[PDB]
Structure formats: structure tokens, C-alpha cells
């Protein structure tokens, strides 16, 4: 068998205290700690997520009904170990994928359903060959329709901004406050709806002291907001999340502890203590949440990320609640390995 | 601070119990979780590191009194996370340095200083185009001089040989028996001497079922050896070295605990009981061993791999001890960090 903390649990399966002896399954066409990008419909009626294969290539799983994988970029396109993050706006007939190349220069893949159409392209990000520091992770927030804006960290580990829009085409835009941690995860959400204009920016990152911080752009420019973690895990991944709860933007803030359990904070009329969702420790690799709000007003969350030992693994708040069952999304050959706690 | 494990520590100045506030290192101009490979001349005189960047190139850290860092392959030339394994013979004149390419595929740089040459250059290898499982690590052996031996994993999982010798260039050797852990780590070493023919080639990598398992080869084939660790850390980091001692092979094995801490399983008339080294914790990423026999007769072990937060660490074993201080080698900027441990 692999050996595993005995203090953790691997699995929805594991005993109650940690793990002690259970099977868990080894995806491996997924590549290790793949990065995760998504988006749910603000309908709930099917599911965007986004990796890397082991062999180097971008894929995608959609769900409607039930999962279909298939592949939106072939190897050489990407950096082996690319972030990844997604757009979705029109309200949902319009998509961008961001990522490195190898030459970890920002690149866009885009796909256009307006109307019925169906077009996937190389996107205009591209060509203006934005080289950015080789352990940046990535964020991106649309408004107004097609303005859109990408966040990446420079070479000199400040956060930094790429704005498209206005007919003017990718230009450079802000330079972000604070003190970034190298490589830290980003997650940047907006919280007005997709064709409002201003938006309303949250970004959520690692401090070079161990802290998390919040970036905050309203009308006037930008500033460290009050959301602060005074420490978390080195090189935690974060994702965050926004979606209209009784209308008013509920902020979902997610990141994991040293157990490798995913806390979440909840900005809905002011931030609400940090709290674990579950007791079940995930590989230390990037996450991705996505919301959307049901007819009831009530906010919905998903998030996907990498289980023990190579799975690609949805959470899912529904009803208020996280339910028990934790789904797994297979992405290719998988072999099932037993495993015992050890102390 | 960052968060850490209250009952891990951290490094060697953590307390006596675990982690409780201390400051860390943050080398960020090295690679998160890089690779590394080793070779420490056998007269000790001299070390040799590799290890990629956080830009993608190769680079190396080599020892002769203080450690000078080198810049050895540019961007571009390695898959970013590639695997890296080198092999150092003539006794001491001739490097192979083997790695990946961004689309899987054999690479070998080479360092030929025989006859007070400094020539570096893109070795034979890569013209075989052979391709690989994109998770395979890498392995390689020497023997009866430039009688070279590569070994990596295959798409199909199996481990695979590739051999370079008598005239005949690069072909495909071996394909080697037993059911591997796809992204097995892979550590092959010689307990015969570089000058020696034949070989006694020994492999050590992960099993589908999560063991440590052993190849061995010896004239008449490739078989299953006896040393077996029945359990081990998923995708734990392996690495393994050889040098004599009283004239009979010592081999080191080298994984990982569940702690992240450095077990050892020694092979000298035997193996002997599995031992955790030190009781820190290293960042869970690939190490590196290397050996030399020294004047009085004993064996001297180096390991390299990453320290918390992300510091090229170098382990020392010397007259019979691991030393307590734990050196880190600089590759680049670098930023101190407080460290606090936390419960569950
Ligand atoms: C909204 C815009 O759509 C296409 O024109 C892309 O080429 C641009 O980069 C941008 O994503
Ligand atoms: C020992 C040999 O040295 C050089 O000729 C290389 O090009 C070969 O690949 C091999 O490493
Ligand atoms: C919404 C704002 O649009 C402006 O053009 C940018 O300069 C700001 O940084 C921000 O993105
Ligand atoms: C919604 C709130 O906006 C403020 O500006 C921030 O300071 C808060 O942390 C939060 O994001
Ligand atoms: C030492 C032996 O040399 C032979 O040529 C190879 O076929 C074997 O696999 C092994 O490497
Ligand atoms: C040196 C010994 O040779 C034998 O063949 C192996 O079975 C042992 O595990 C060990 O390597």
C-alpha cells in the first residue's frame, strides 16, 4: 500500500479520525497537481472545468446530464505546470481560457456561442507576447460585457494587470499594491453583475509575510481591502467566488490549511470567521470555485481541485449545505491503490 | 507567518518538540519542488549539483572549497519540472547530464574535460528522439568506462532501458520486469567501479501496489531483486548510491517518511533495518544521494533536495554521524519568512 498520514483523512471514506486502511484511485493522464479553471452557468444548467493532461494538453470536462471530456489545446501549447483561469459572459455564450506558454508568455483561448455559433480560436492576448514571472499564477475578471481583465504577477512579483477593451485592443494596466508573495495562487472575482459597468474587483492573494491579502479596485483606483489571514500555509492555493445572495454579492473565499482542508470565508454584509468545509485533506494544489444563484436567491458553490491520490474531486454546496458525497471526474486511465494510515 | 505542521520541524534550528515560530527561506529563483542530480568526485575533493531554475534553465552548484553557481542549459531546453540524473566518470573528467525535453524526449548534456578540455555540448542522444512516459523520471548508469545506461518509463509504464557502448551508438536495451507506479521516481546506481566490466546494476522504484521494489541486473539478465519495502508514501522521492566499503559494495537507499523525513536502508552483507536519518522535514520533492569512500576507509554520503520553504538543503554524513547543521546553497534571491506551527 502508499502510506498516509494517520492524523488525515484521504477519503469521504476514511474513519472518522484518519485514515487506518481504504482503496483511493491514482488518475494518472491527469497531470499532478494540475491547475483548475471553471465556471458553472449562472443557469446551473451545465459545468466548465479545465486542466492539464498528463501529456502537456489543456482539456476540458463539461457537464450536462454527465461529463464529457475533450481536449482544447494539444501539447506544445502550454507550459507543463500551466495556472489556468476562465471567463464567462453574454450572460453564459461566451468563454476565455487564460495560460502560459512555454515562454510563460499570457495566451487566451476563446469560444464564441453566441447565437448557436460555435468557435474556438486563438485569442488577440497573444500577440502582444506579455512575458510574465515563470511561477505566476492567473486571474481574469470580465464587466460591461467584453472588458475584460487579466492578472498575472511581473517579474518583479508585484501583481499586474492586462486590460482589453474600449476598441483599444490588450493594453498594460495597473500595477497592483502590496507585497505579493513569488508564486503566490490569485483568484480575482468581480462582484457587480457581467454587463454592469463600473465592476467591482476583489482579488485574493499570499503576502510575502505568509499572510492572505484582498486587493479592491472601485471607481478611483486600487487598495489593499480589510480581508486579511494573518497565516496560512506556504504557497496555499485560493480560489475565490462571488454570486448575488438576497441581492447582495456573497464573496466566497477559498484556501487550505496545514491539514490540506479547505477553508472558506464568506464576505455577504461583512466577512464571517474562516471556517473548514469538510475534514478531508486534498493534494496541496490548485483549486477552482464557481457559484451561481438559484431562483430562490439562495447561492449555490462547486469547487474542484485534486483528491487524494490523483483525482479530479467536486465539492458542492447546494441548499446550504456541503453535501457529503464528493464526486470524482474521470480524465483517463486510473489504477485503484490501497492505503494505511501511518503515525 | 506561514502555517506548518506543529509536530514537523521545519529545519534544524526548530524546537527540540516540533515547529513552534521560527524563520525560514524562500529561494524563489529555484524551482518549486526542482530536481536535482549529484556526483561527488570519488576523492571527495570536489561536488557537483544540478537543479532547474524557476526560468526553466539548468543550472549548477559545484563545490571546491565554497559553492559557484553556473548557468549549463538555457530556457527552452528542458520540460519545466523535468527529471535530471547524471553520470560522472574517467575517473572524474567525463559528465552526461540526462533530462527531458519540452515534448518528452530523451536529452543528454555533456562535459568532456579529459586532456584540459571544457567542452559542453549536446550529446548523441538526442538524435534517438526517444520518447517517453511525460510523469518518467530518469535513471542511468556507467561501467567499463563510456558504456553508458539509460533508464526511464515508458508510455506504457514499464521501466525501459536504453544503452550506449561498443561502437553501436544509441539503441533500445532492456525492457525491465515488474509492474511500476506510473511517475515512479528512479534511482539506478553501479556497485561495480566505473572501470569495471561487467556491471552490477541495481534500480530502485515504486510498484503499482505503493512497495519499493528493486531491478537487478547481473550477467545472464534483468530479474527482481529481494529488497522490498511493502509500503511508502505515494509518489515518494528515491534515491540511491554506492561506494565500497572494506572492498564489498555499501548501497544507501534513500525515501521519504509520511513526515516527509529521510529514511536510509543500507545493503552491505545484507540489508539492514530501514532508520530515519534526521527528524526534519523536507519539502516532499525529488533528492539526490551521492557517496565517496574516504582515506580511512569509510563511506561519506551527500544528499540534496529542497528544504522549507524552498532552499537547496545539503545533508552531510561524515565519520560515521549526520551532521546536525544543515547547509543550504544559494541559487538566487531569496526571502526570510517566519514559520509558526499549527494544530488541527
Ligand atoms: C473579447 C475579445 O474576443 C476576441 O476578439 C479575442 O481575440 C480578444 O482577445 C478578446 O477576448
Ligand atoms: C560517451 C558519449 O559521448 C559523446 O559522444 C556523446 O555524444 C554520446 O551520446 C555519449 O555520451
Ligand atoms: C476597471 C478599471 O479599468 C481601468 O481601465 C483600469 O486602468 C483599472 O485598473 C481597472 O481595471
Ligand atoms: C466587499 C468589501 O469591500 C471592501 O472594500 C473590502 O475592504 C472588504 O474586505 C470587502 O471586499
Ligand atoms: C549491462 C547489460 O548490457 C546489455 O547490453 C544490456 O542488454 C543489458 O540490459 C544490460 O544493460
Ligand atoms: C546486493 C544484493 O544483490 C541481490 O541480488 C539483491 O537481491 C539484493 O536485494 C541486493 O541488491
Known amino acids: 500500500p502508499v502510506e498516509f498520514p494517520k492524523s488525515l483523512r484521504a477519503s469521504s471514506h476514511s474513519s472518522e479520525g484518519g485514515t487506518t486502511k481504504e482503496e483511493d484511485i491514482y488518475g494518472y493522464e491527469l497531470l499532478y497537481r494540475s491547475a483548475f479553471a471553471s465556471?458553472?452557468?449562472?443557469?446551473?444548467?451545465?459545468?466548465?472545468?479545465?486542466?492539464?493532461?498528463?501529456?502537456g494538453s489543456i482539456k476540458q470536462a463539461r457537464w450536462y446530464g454527465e461529463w464529457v471530456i475533450s481536449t482544447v489545446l494539444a501539447p506544445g501549447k502550454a507550459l507543463q505546470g500551466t495556472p489556468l483561469t476562465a471567463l464567462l459572459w453574454g450572460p453564459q455564450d461566451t468563454v476565455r481560457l487564460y495560460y502560459l506558454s512555454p515562454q510563460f508568455e499570457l495566451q487566451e483561448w476563446c469560444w464564441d456561442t453566441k447565437?448557436?455559433?460555435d468557435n474556438k480560436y486563438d485569442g488577440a492576448l497573444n500577440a502582444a507576447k506579455v512575458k510574465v514571472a515563470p511561477y505566476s499564477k492567473?486571474?481574469?475578471?470580465?464587466?460591461?460585457?467584453?472588458?475584460?481583465?487579466?492578472?498575472?504577477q511581473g517579474t518583479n512579483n508585484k501583481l499586474e494587470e492586462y486590460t482589453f477593451g474600449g476598441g483599444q485592443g490588450w493594453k498594460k494596466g495597473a500595477t497592483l499594491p502590496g507585497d505579493p508573495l513569488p508564486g503566490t495562487y490569485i483568484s480575482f472575482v468581480n462582484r457587480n453583475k457581467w454587463?454592469?459597468?463600473?465592476?467591482?474587483?476583489?482579488?485574493?492573494f499570499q503576502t510575502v509575510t505568509g499572510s492572505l491579502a484582498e486587493q479592491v479596485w472601485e471607481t478611483g483606483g486600487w487598495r489593499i481591502g480589510?480581508?486579511?489571514?494573518?497565516?496560512?500555509?506556504?504557497?496555499?492555493?485560493?480560489?475565490?467566488?462571488?454570486?448575488?445572495?438576497?441581492?447582495?454579492?456573497k464573496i466566497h473565499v477559498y484556501w487550505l490549511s496545514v491539514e490540506s482542508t479547505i477553508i472558506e470565508s464568506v464576505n455577504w454584509?461583512?466577512?464571517?470567521?474562516?471556517?473548514?468545509?469538510?475534514?478531508?485533506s486534498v493534494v496541496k494544489a490548485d483549486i477552482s470555485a464557481t457559484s451561481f444563484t438559484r431562483d430562490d436567491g439562495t447561492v449555490d458553490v462547486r469547487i474542484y481541485g485534486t483528491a487524494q491520490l490523483n483525482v479530479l474531486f467536486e465539492r458542492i454546496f447546494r441548499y446550504g449545505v456541503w453535501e457529503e458525497k464528493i464526486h470524482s471526474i474521470s480524465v483517463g486511465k486510473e489504477i485503484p491503490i490501497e492505503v494505511v494510515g501511518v503515525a
Do not use: C, M
Open 226 to 249: 480589510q480581508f486579511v489571514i494573518p497565516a496560512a500555509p506556504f504557497l496555499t492555493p485560493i480560489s475565490a467566488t462571488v454570486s448575488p445572495e438576497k441581492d447582495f454579492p
Open 39 to 55: 465556471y458553472i452557468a449562472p443557469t446551473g444548467a451545465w459545468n466548465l472545468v479545465w486542466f492539464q493532461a498528463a501529456d
Open 269 to 280: 454584509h461583512g466577512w464571517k470567521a474562516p471556517k473548514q468545509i469538510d475534514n478531508i
Open 138 to 152: 492567473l486571474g481574469a475578471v470580465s464587466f460591461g460585457g467584453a472588458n475584460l481583465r487579466v492578472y498575472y
Open 115 to 117: 447565437n448557436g455559433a
Open 195 to 204: 454587463d454592469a459597468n463600473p465592476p467591482s474587483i476583489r482579488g485574493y
